[PDB]
Design a protein around this ligand. Structure first.
Ligand SMILES: CCCCCCCCCCCCCCCCCC(=O)OC[C@H](COP(=O)([O-])OCC(O)COP(=O)([O-])OC[C@@H](COC(=O)CCCCCCCCCCCCCCCCC)OC(=O)CCCCCCCCCCCCCCCCC)OC(=O)CCCCCCCCCCCCCCCCC
Ligand SMILES: CCCCCCCCCCCCCCCCCC(=O)OC[C@H](COP(=O)([O-])OCC[N+](C)(C)C)OC(=O)CCCCCCCCCCCCCCCCC
Ligand SMILES: CCCCCCCCCCCCCCCCCC(=O)OC[C@H](COP(=O)([O-])OCC[N+](C)(C)C)OC(=O)CCCCCCCCCCCCCCCCC
Ligand SMILES: CCCCCCCCCCCCCCCCCC(=O)OC[C@H](COP(=O)([O-])OCC[N+](C)(C)C)OC(=O)CCCCCCCCCCCCCCCCC
Ligand SMILES: CCCCCCCCCCCCCCCCCC(=O)OC[C@H](COP(=O)(O)OCCN)OC(=O)CCCCCCCCCCCCCCCCC
Ligand SMILES: CCCCCCCCCCCCCCCCCC(=O)OC[C@H](COP(=O)(O)OCCN)OC(=O)CCCCCCCCCCCCCCCCC
Ligand SMILES: Nc1nc2c(ncn2[C@@H]2O[C@H](COP(=O)(O)OP(=O)(O)OP(=O)(O)O)[C@@H](O)[C@H]2O)c(=O)[nH]1
Lengths: 98, 347, 139, 49, 459, 55, 320, 120, 63
């Protein structure tokens, strides 16, 4: 388990940490969401290439197919929250507190 | 939303959940979750109220985070095992990552502050679909991987759910909010028995599905969303709220109503596993769930509440909608205790 | 969680300083958890008050841990009897009054004694008996 | 007659009700025949008679 | 026992599709017929309990309670006729359904074979009474009354469930016959104390016991009259029937941990009887009286002597007939005066001759004149307690003296004295409530002639 | 003093108040998403390592 | 088959029949301004159906034979208390307006069902966007306090946003001194008691809030009484109008599916007429509501859902 | 306790192997109770739909009871099959593993020292 | 009826419940050891099937 595995695993942790610390931006939040996807794609690519799991080389592709699909969903949701509330800071949508 | 697109949108949700319960490959299980999330977000914001947008939004970030963590926990399992099959997880960190990864989809432990107001903002129709159908998929994954589960973590997940769910419901008026905390309370009950006997949580799931279904489409018929709005239904529809008493009592587990069958049968199983202190605990803290059930029962028809003069022509008109299996759902949700040994059909 | 087993590593009664320190650490550690949540979901206003809130909860929990530490070892020493539910019971207003004194009030403090009184008695019961909480699946 | 507009269930739907008895007898004689053949399947599986 | 179960559940369709005015006549007549059929259950062998079926069995303890329930059911039917006239027919049938459902659960509870089946219908009685107490009550507080009555019983019920299912995994069965026949000594291990405890507070919370009784004054004084009798007459005794059952296995633990409840009770009735003497509401006295009378029963069961068990059974049945009478008696006065204040309507003998009698021996049975079964149960407790400890005598002897003190006090403060001249609505006493008291009292003297049928299986 | 002042204060009202008092702090959530997911992060972190549920 | 989502899936559309002939119109005239004559005159010649002004008992016509039910069971209020003594603590005045509000909800609702299931336009006498005119005139004349008034708009906004304004309307203009003479000329004894300032308050609200805010939702056709008695020019201009400005063209079939779905079932149409707001003129006593709800039950037909009441016929119940 | 036992064909309600078991009797109280559930469901249907409860449309009512008994019947046949399987692996495993379930001799009451706790 | 009613009825009832009692205790331990050892008809958790493996000659000789 060489150091490149450490780099991208520790990377995904900061993607997890980055997502879980929304400061003032939904768009920057979605950035960290797609950020997670890099490390998962990159680690998955390293795994099935190292192990010569040739039939499983499709798995990183199918990750990406369902990757941007969420990415489109996030921005489409971001379209209306910014459209009808003006901005994208995740603090002005607290009307559901009650 | 046009009717035809709505149907295909629903079918995608059912297909997404069905993909989870039939696939043997971890990637496909993740895909089934992804399709389930993708087809559901439009369903929540069907009416396009301002509330539904962030209600659907809070759904998205929570479950996307859960899906991404689930994908990561899958990847480590592949790294240390080279397997995609749903048998068990050969890295303890991989398992200890999926429990919360699946928990936020279920909404059990403090990964639950999304459940109340996502139920509140969205309509009653999708609220029913959210709290009943969206739990078969994550629970099905848990049932398959039930072998390699850290009992200390999984039990704490459920114990926290019962305490918070019961405690939170005591301070809710909006009927959807109380249902969410009540659902969270039942979340712990099903998941507490998960490590010991997976047949039991299936039984509790089936009973809870009937409880939440029958309760909700009674709320749909009553066309009420807050406790005060429900109160007036005694003036118009006395039988609906009178039936709502028995379902509320059953939902609280007050026997011999059908709602006792999970709470009873579960307790019997864990005492077989020398677990005694914890079963006594949820027996105690199921009572706070019962509290706001009776308060709902008191406010609905156990005590007739002040009405509104605008109800005359309301009595002049009957419902045109046609809830089906409602007469059936009440029967299973109230009186199936004599057929308790039927749990062996699941086994 | 190794620090939790450190309580069982040192036998009761003896190492009264160590037992008090162990429970003080157990209380202080648990104090960090609740403060970390409370500082999170309950909104702060500044860094100064955030640690001030952290200090308050850590102070109570560490103090609650400590006194239960002393009361346990001294009771097992004055009576020279380790196995005693009362040994943990006298931690009742030991914890209750101090927690009701950290936020000085007779209502919370006096009403507290019993609640962790039998709880401390009950955890001692499982210490002596074979009671398990998170029992693994036997059947 | 009282309701001037044709009530939504003013008259029976002879298609709907006629189906209802039509299927119900099916539900019975299936169960009746199934109960018998299960009994015949009994007495020779274990050689009861 | 389905010869009683089947007709009892058959009362539901008959009462639910009868005519808008025949519901009272039909329900009363056939419930009485069920009582006559239930009278055949008085037959008991030497010691073999009547084992009708696998899931149903009865002995000399279950049947007297069984007849008490069945005989009682027409009594609330006639009592409720007064204040249920101003109601719609559908809701009236709903009221009858709750009473019949309450009866049906009671018969299954007493005739249950194993403890878990007994537990299911035992607790199941909470639901019919919860609707009765809350829906058909009279005052704002009834909402707080239902929660107090529900949670109190449930708070103790759940620990018993955990202990009961634990019995099945350890002993192998929960059937009462096997448990008593396969009875084994219970060790004094620290777990076994809680094992003993979890099977106790469920029965004593609804007894009620001193301290854990506050639901009793908060429900009986506040429930509708029909629910008031069944609560006091039988529902409290559900703990008694269970405790004679559960004590067959919980030995020899009872020697030690009876103490914290014994003098909790022993100081209890004397304390409670003192509260009865100084009440302000009528129904509050009888409710506080009921726990006082129930308190000696707690000592009777716990002391574990054959004489006390016979005394427990006799006092159990005698108190049910009594407490039902006084609660009915208070209802009669409350209806005309629209309140329950004691000194509100003192001095009514001059206007209520037959009532003044119905006060007279009902209180005397509360004083327990000899040879009423109240003393036969009470005196047997005394002899058993004295054999246990001589110093016992002063306490409950003083209690039955302060019991005597109040038990004439409402007689003085309701019948003795001068009428209130502003009151002018005390009409001629209707035969309905009048005959209701007759059906209450005559079985008491009839059972006084042959008490040998109500001392339980230990006779 | 004994019955109507202490008994209902020694068991029913205390437990009812305890649920009453802290049901508020559970349910008085302002709804900030940043605060919700921050609690997720702490729960995620203390799940392992600190509580060592992975060990 | 009733129009549900199944029909739309089958292809049942209403935009195909929604044409220039589907004009839902109503003559919003003053009190005794001849608006009913003008409305019916439009009806005969334009081919449109006539909806008489939905009164307190129009809902009784929507449910069953149509005989006006008892006042206590069909509104709890009546019109004579309005006109004779329009000041009392019982608040019959607003109970009229609150009840009369829901009547025009149905009157417009049945107007929809006519021209979305057939495409044939209708004629009414005033409509939902006329009830506030009376209520605004109610407050200025000292009838019922503003707490009812401020609740009125809250209820009005949540029972009309889903509702689409009509195609056109007609405002008949009759001078207010003449109207006071007209009401005095008819001889209805309740018409004598009417304050003269009430009529001009109706005229003011007609040309202060209704006509201005209506202009961008339907065409202004303000016609004087001298322009009202002639029944032709009031309808040639309707044909010579454009029906361009307004939200009607931009309502595709999916809006019409949403529209007819909500208006097919009245229960959610007036679900927000019974807001849990307790008011002196609206909050019936628990006992009073209970008996009154019972009182509604002994009435024939009003025991089971329509088509099941054996008391008024409905044979073959054991199969229905 | 059974989804992992060998030979368990998935998604197969009643195995052909299960036909060797006694079919549930038609009078079976478990079965007739499920018929009552259909009867009760019919009455609930007319209550919400505002219909003459008991005397309302029998075809809607009679369908409910007829449906419930049927799905009740196969559920009861599956009931005993699984219980029989529980009792089949019961004794085969007991015979296969005899040493962990030893036979207990007889040590009759006349010889046990069991004491009598004085109940005084 | 005579005491032979209740006497023989109890004999049947007591015996039948006795067999159930012992069987219940036997089931508890049988499941307990079957779950632990796993060498039993049930509790066999699924594993990878061996028919999926391909045995045909691959590209490299040494595998
Ligand atoms: C337990 C096992 C049994 C489960 C039984 C489920 C019972 C459901 C009862 C519904 C009764 C009807 C009523 O009053 O409905 C209210 C309600 C609809 O509310 P509404 O206001 O009457 O709808 C108006 C239309 O939208 C007006 O139409 P529109 O113009 O808006 O167009 C949309 C319309 C189009 O509908 C169609 O085209 C048909 O959509 C629907 O009608 C929804 C259903 C679509 C088809 C779904 C087919 C599934 C197979 O029903 C739902 O929301 C249904 C949700 C989806 C199905 C149930 C999912 C929950 C169950 C999951 C767990 C299953 C078991 C797991 C183990
Ligand atoms: C419920 C309360 C249960 C007991 C809680 C702890 C109280 C305590 O420390 O008691 C020590 C004392 C000391 O007991 P002890 O140690 O002398 O004897 C206990 C029993 N053996 C010898 C087997 C270990 O115990 C009790 O007070 C027991 C009381 C039991 C009954 C409680 C009734 C409460 C109502
Ligand atoms: C597992 C659960 C137990 C362990 C975990 C919990 C430990 C902490 C328990 C205390 C939580 C906070 C309690 C707050 C509190 O007591 O406030 C003062 C409370 C509430 O005060 P209050 O707000 O009711 O005061 C005003 C009263 N009125 C309105 C009538 C004027 O004080 C009391 O309830 C009265 C004094 C205490 C009486 C009981 C003391 C003995 C213990 C009885 C139970 C034994 C078992
Ligand atoms: C009445 C009150 C009590 C209710 C209890 C539950 C009753 C409702 C559920 C019963 C029907 C659904 C389950 C049975 C079914 O349809 O197929 C069973 C099953 C469906 O296949 P399955 O069992 O693989 O599907 C579910 C998978 N598990 C068990 C993990 C949840 O048919 C079979 O052939 C099972 C074979 C294995 C048996 C062991
Ligand atoms: C136990 C079940 C009942 C629990 C208590 C319920 C509340 C108390 C009862 C009164 C409820 C209020 C009421 O109006 O009850 C009558 C109501 C029907 O009223 P109505 O429409 O006049 O009936 C016409 C019948 N041809 O009808 C009802 O309320 C019917 C109540 C049915 C309750 C569920 C039964 C499920 C099966 C057992
Ligand atoms: C307070 C939370 C419980 C933990 C407190 C710390 C004490 C402890 O060790 O708890 C774990 C307990 C005992 O087991 P162990 O850790 O081994 O230490 C005793 C010696 N073997 O592990 C057990 O399983 C024993 C029983 C623990 C206490 C259960 C009852 C708690 C009080 C009632 C419910 C609230
Ligand atoms: N409160 C209230 N009263 C209404 C409403 N609609 C109609 N009315 C009353 O209906 C009654 C009759 O209306 P008018 O316009 O005078 O009827 P008309 O005499 O036929 O009128 P013309 O056709 O112009 O002659 C009046 O008392 C109106 O105030 C409504 O929505 N609310």
């Amino acid at each position: 388990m060489p150091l490149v595995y450490m780099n991208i695993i520790m990377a995904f942790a900061i993607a997890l940490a980055g997502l879980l610390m929304y400061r003032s931006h939904l768009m920057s939040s979605l950035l960290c969401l797609e950020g997670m996807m890099l490390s998962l794609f990159i680690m998955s690519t390293l795994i099935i290439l190292n192990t010569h799991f040739t039939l499983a080389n499709m798995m990183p592709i199918i990750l990406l197919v369902f990757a941007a699909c969420e990415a489109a969903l996030g921005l489409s949701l971001l379209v209306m929250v910014s459209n009808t509330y003006g901005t994208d800071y995740v603090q002005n949508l607290n009307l559901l507190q009650c | 939303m046009n009717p035809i697109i709505y149907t295909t949108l629903i079918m995608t949700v059912m297909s997404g959940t069905m993909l989870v319960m039939i696939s043997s490959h971890w990637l496909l299980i993740w895909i089934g979750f992804e399709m389930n999330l993708l087809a559901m977000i439009p369903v929540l914001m069907k009416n396009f109220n301002p509330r539904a947008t962030e209600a659907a939004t809070k759904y998205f970030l929570t479950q996307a985070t859960a899906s991404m963590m689930l994908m990561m926990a899958i990847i480590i399992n592949l790294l240390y095992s080279g397997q995609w099959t749903i048998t068990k997880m050969f890295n303890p960190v991989a398992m200890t990552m999926m429990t919360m990864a699946l928990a936020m989809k279920l909404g059990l432990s403090p990964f639950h502050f999304w459940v109340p107001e996502v139920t509140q903002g969205i309509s009653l129709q999708a609220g029913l679909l959210l709290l009943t159908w969206q739990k078969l998929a994550p629970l099905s994954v848990l049932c398959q991987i039930s072998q390699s589960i850290n009992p200390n973590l999984m039990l704490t997940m459920a114990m926290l759910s019962i305490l918070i769910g019961g405690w939170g419901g005591l301070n809710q008026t909006q009927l959807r909010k109380i249902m969410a905390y009540s659902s969270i309370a039942h979340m712990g009950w099903m998941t507490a028995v998960l490590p010991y006997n997976t047949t039991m949580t299936i039984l509790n799931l089936l009973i809870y599905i009937t409880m939440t279904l029958a309760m909700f489409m009674l709320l749909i018929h009553s066309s009420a969303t807050t406790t005060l709005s429900l109160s007036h239904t005694w003036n118009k529809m006395p039988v609906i709220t009178s039936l709502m008493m028995v379902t509320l009592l059953s939902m609280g587990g007050l026997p011999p109503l059908s709602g006792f069958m999970p709470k009873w049968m579960i307790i019997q199983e864990m005492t077989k596993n020398e677990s005694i202190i914890m079963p006594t605990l949820m027996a105690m803290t199921a009572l706070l769930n019962l509290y706001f059930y009776m308060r709902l029962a008191y406010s609905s028809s156990l005590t007739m509440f002040p009405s509104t003069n605008n109800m005359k022509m309301k009595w002049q008109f009957e419902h045109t909608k046609q809830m089906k299996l409602l007469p059936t759902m009440i029967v299973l949700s109230t009186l199936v205790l004599p057929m308790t040994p039927a749990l062996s059909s699941l086994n | 969680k190794t620090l939790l087993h450190k309580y069982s590593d040192i036998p009761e009664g003896t190492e009264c300083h160590r037992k008090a320190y162990a429970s003080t650490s157990i209380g202080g550690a648990t104090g960090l958890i609740v403060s970390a949540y409370s500082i999170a979901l309950k909104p702060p206003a500044s860094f100064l008050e955030g640690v001030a809130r952290t200090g308050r909860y850590t102070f109570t929990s560490a103090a609650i841990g400590a006194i239960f530490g002393l009361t346990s070892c001294i009771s097992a020493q004055v009576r020279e009897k380790p196995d005693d539910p009362l040994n943990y019971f006298i931690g009742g207003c030991a914890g209750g009054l101090t927690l009701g004194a950290r936020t000085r009030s007779y209502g919370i403090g006096a009403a507290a004694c019993a609640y962790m009184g039998l709880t401390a008695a009950l955890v001692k019961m499982g210490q002596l008996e074979g009671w398990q909480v998170f029992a693994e699946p036997k059947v | 007659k009282f309701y001037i507009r044709e009530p939504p269930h003013g008259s029976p739907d002879w298609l709907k009700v006629g189906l209802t008895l039509g299927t119900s007898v099916f539900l019975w004689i299936y169960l009746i025949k199934q109960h018998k053949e299960d009994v015949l399947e009994y007495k020779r599986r274990n050689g009861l008679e | 026992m389905l010869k009683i179960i089947i007709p009892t559940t058959m009362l539901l369709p008959m009462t639910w599709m009868s005519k808008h005015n025949m519901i009272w006549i039909n329900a009363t007549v056939h419930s009485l017929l069920i009582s006559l059929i239930s009278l055949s259950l008085l037959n008991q062998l030497g010691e073999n309990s009547l084992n009708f079926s696998l899931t149903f069995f009865s002995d000399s303890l279950s049947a007297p309670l069984l007849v008490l329930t069945t005989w009682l059911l027409p009594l609330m039917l006639m009592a409720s006729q007064s204040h249920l006239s101003k109601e719609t027919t559908t809701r009236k049938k709903l009221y009858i359904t709750m009473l019949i459902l309450l009866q049906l659960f009671l018969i299954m509870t007493f005739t249950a074979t194993e403890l878990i089946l007994f537990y299911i219908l035992f607790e199941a009685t909470l639901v019919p009474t919860l609707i009765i107490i809350t829906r058909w009550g009279n005052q704002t507080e009834r909402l707080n009354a239902g929660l107090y009555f529900l949670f109190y019983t449930l708070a103790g019920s759940l620990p018993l469930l955990v202990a009961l299912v634990y019995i099945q995994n350890t002993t192998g069965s929960l059937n009462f016959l096997i448990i008593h026949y396969w009875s084994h000594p219970l060790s004094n291990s620290w777990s076994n104390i809680f094992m003993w405890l979890a099977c106790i507070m469920a029965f004593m919370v609804k007894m009620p016991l001193y301290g854990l009784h506050l639901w009793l004054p908060k429900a009986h004084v506040e429930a509708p009259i029909a629910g008031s009798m069944v609560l006091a007459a039988v529902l409290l005794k559900l703990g008694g029937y269970g405790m004679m059952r559960i004590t067959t296995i919980l030995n020899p633990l009872t020697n030690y941990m009876a103490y914290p409840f014994l003098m909790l009770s022993m100081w209890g009735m004397i304390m409670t009887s003192s509260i009865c003497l100084r009440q302000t509401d009528l129904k509050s006295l009888i409710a506080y009286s009921s726990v006082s009378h129930m308190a000696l029963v707690i000592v009777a069961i716990m002391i574990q002597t054959p004489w006390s068990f016979m005394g427990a059974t006799a006092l159990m049945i005698a108190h049910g007939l009594t407490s039902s009478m006084l609660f009915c008696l208070a209802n009669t006065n409350y209806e005309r005066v629209h309140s329950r204040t004691m000194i509100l309507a003192r001095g009514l003998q001059t206007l209520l001759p037959l009532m003044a009698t119905w006060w007279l021996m009902a209180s005397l049975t509360n004083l327990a004149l000899p040879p009423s079964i109240n003393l036969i149960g009470e005196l047997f407790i005394i002899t058993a307690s004295f054999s246990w400890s001589n110093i016992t005598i002063i306490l409950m002897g003083m209690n039955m003296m302060i019991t005597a003190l109040y038990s004439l006090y409402m007689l003085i403060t309701t019948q003795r004295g001068k009428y209130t001249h502003h009151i002018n609505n005390i009409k001629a006493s209707f035969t309905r409530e009048n005959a209701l008291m007759a059906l209450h009292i005559l079985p008491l003297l009839l059972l006084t002639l042959n008490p040998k049928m109500i001392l339980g299986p230990l006779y | 003093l004994l019955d109507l002042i202490w008994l209902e204060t020694i068991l029913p009202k205390t437990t009812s108040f305890i649920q009453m008092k802290m049901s508020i702090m559970v349910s008085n959530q302002k709804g900030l998403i940043k605060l919700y997911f921050l609690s997720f992060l702490i729960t995620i972190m203390i799940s392992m390592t600190l509580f060592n549920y992975h060990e | 088959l009733q129009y549900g989502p199944l029909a739309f899936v089958l292809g049942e559309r209403t935009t195909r029949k929604l044409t220039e002939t589907s004009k839902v119109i109503t003559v919003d005239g003053n009190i005794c301004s001849g608006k009913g004559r003008l409305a019916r005159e439009i009806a005969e010649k334009l081919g449109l159906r006539h909806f008489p002004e939905a009164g307190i008992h129009y809902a009784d016509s929507t449910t069953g034979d149509g005989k006006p039910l008892d006042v206590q069971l069909s509104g709890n209020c009546s019109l004579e208390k309005f006109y004779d003594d329009p000041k009392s603590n019982d608040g019959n005045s607003y109970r009229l307006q609150s009840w009369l509000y829901a009547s025009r909800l149905l009157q417009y609702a049945d107007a929809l069902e006519h021209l979305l299931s057939t495409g044939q336009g209708v004629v009414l006498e005033r409509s939902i966007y006329s009830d506030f005119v009376f209520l605004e005139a109610m407050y200025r004349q000292g009838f019922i306090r503003k707490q009812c008034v401020e609740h009125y708009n809250e209820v009005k906004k949540v029972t009309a946003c889903e509702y689409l304004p009509p195609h056109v309307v007609v405002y008949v203009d009759v001078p207010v001194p003449e109207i006071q003479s007209r009401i005095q000329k008819k001889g209805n004894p309740h018409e004598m008691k009417i304050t003269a300032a009430y009529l001009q308050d109706i005229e003011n609200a007609y040309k202060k809030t209704f006509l201005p805010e209506m202009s961008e939702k339907c065409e202004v056709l303000q016609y004087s009484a001298r322009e009202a008695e002639d029944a032709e020019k009031v309808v040639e201009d309707i044909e010579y109008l454009k029906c361009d400005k307004g939200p009607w063209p931009d309502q595709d079939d999916r809006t019409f599916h949403r529209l007819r779905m909500l208006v097919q079932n009245k229960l959610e149409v007036l679900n927000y007429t019974t807001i849990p707001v307790y008011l002196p003129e609206i909050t019936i006593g628990a006992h009073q509501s209970d008996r009154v709800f019972q009182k509604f039950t002994e009435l024939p037909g009003r025991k089971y859902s329509p088509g099941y009441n054996e008391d008024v016929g409905d044979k073959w119940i054991w199969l229905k | 306790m059974m989804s992992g036992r060998p030979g368990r064909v998935p998604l197969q309600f009643l195995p052909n192997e299960a036909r060797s078991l006694p079919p549930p009797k038609l009078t079976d109280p478990r079965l007739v109770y499920m018929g009552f559930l259909g009867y009760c469901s019919g009455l609930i249907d007319n209550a919400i739909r505002r219909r003459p409860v008991v005397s309302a449309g029998l075809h809607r009512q009679l369908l409910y009871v007829t449906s419930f008994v049927f799905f009740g019947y196969y559920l009861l046949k599956r009931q005993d099959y699984m219980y029989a399987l529980r009792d089949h692996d019961m004794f085969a495993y007991v015979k296969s593993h005899p040493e962990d379930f030893p036979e207990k001799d007889k040590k009759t009451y006349g010889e046990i020292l069991e004491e009598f706790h004085p109940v005084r | 009826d005579g005491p032979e009613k209740n006497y023989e009825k109890t004999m049947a009832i007591l015996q039948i419940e006795a067999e159930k009692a012992e069987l219940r205790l036997k089931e508890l331990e049988v499941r307990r050891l079957m779950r632990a050892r796993g060498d039993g008809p049930w509790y066999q958790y699924p594993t990878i099937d061996k028919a999926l493996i391909d045995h045909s000659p691959k590209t490299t000789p040494d595998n």
